[PDB]
Design a binder for this molecule. Structure first.
Ligand SMILES: CN[C@H]1CO[C@@H]2OC[C@H](OC(=O)N[C@@H](Cc3ccccc3)[C@H](O)CN(CC(C)C)S(=O)(=O)c3ccc(OC)cc3)[C@@H]21
Ligand SMILES: [Cl-]
Ligand SMILES: [Cl-]
Ligand SMILES: [Cl-]
Ligand code: NA
Ligand code: NA
Lengths: 99, 99
């Protein structure tokens, strides 16, 4: 699709067997999802944005379906105010910015 | 151009006659720039990101060049960790997300 930016670019995702809404976010290096359980191992990480840092759990090799396109990658889980799909997964669905 | 996301989507901007680097950020509603001087009056705004809220100075109707495209619009100035071009000016340069 082509997504204009008059509104937030929100899409439906499926992760951990759950459907959620997330923001397609080119300014995010990594994908950060609100607190939820995921299977497998994880390690702690700090990530920073506007406001400062939050502690997250880093899960590797997680499959996510983004607007109907399957991708695999690292997913950070923690107290983000919004679910964010960042570049590590946007690349895998072939997403580009065009102007 | 068509910009892939394997690297940060950094571009050159020009504001107040200075060149700066900024991130094209579809997850940002607003454009937020590191401390600098801008002409005219400002209004208060609080913006929230991953690690909480910050106070910024809101300058309206500021001329800014972004990757060679002219925009004139609102710029927020404050302690952001990186300069961010948000949807308010991404729409002015005609940017879309595509996959
Ligand atoms: C709520 N208001 C926010 C949205 O619109 C306003 O505009 C400015 C601000 O937007 C944001 O902070 N947006 C966030 C994404 C975002 C969106 C919403 C809440 C929090 C974060 C942004 O797209 C991604 N952020 C990084 C940039 C600040 C460099 S981040 O969420 O902090 C982030 C940092 C490291 C990551 O991996 C290492 C992954 C993500 C304001
Ligand atoms: Cl859960
Ligand atoms: Cl990854
Ligand atoms: Cl590619
Ligand atoms: Na894993
Ligand atoms: Na002004």
């Amino acid at each position: 699709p082509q997504i204009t930016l008059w509104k937030r670019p929100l899409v439906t995702i499926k992760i951990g067997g759950q459907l959620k809404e997330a923001l397609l976010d080119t300014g995010a290096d990594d994908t950060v999802i609100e607190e939820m359980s995921l299977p497998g191992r994880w390690k702690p990480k700090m990530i920073g944005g506007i406001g400062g840092f939050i502690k997250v759990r880093q899960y590797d090799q997680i499959i996510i379906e983004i607007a109907g396109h399957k991708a695999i990658g690292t997913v950070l889980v923690g107290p983000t105010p919004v679910n964010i799909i960042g570049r590590n997964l946007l690349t895998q669905i072939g997403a580009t910015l065009n102007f």
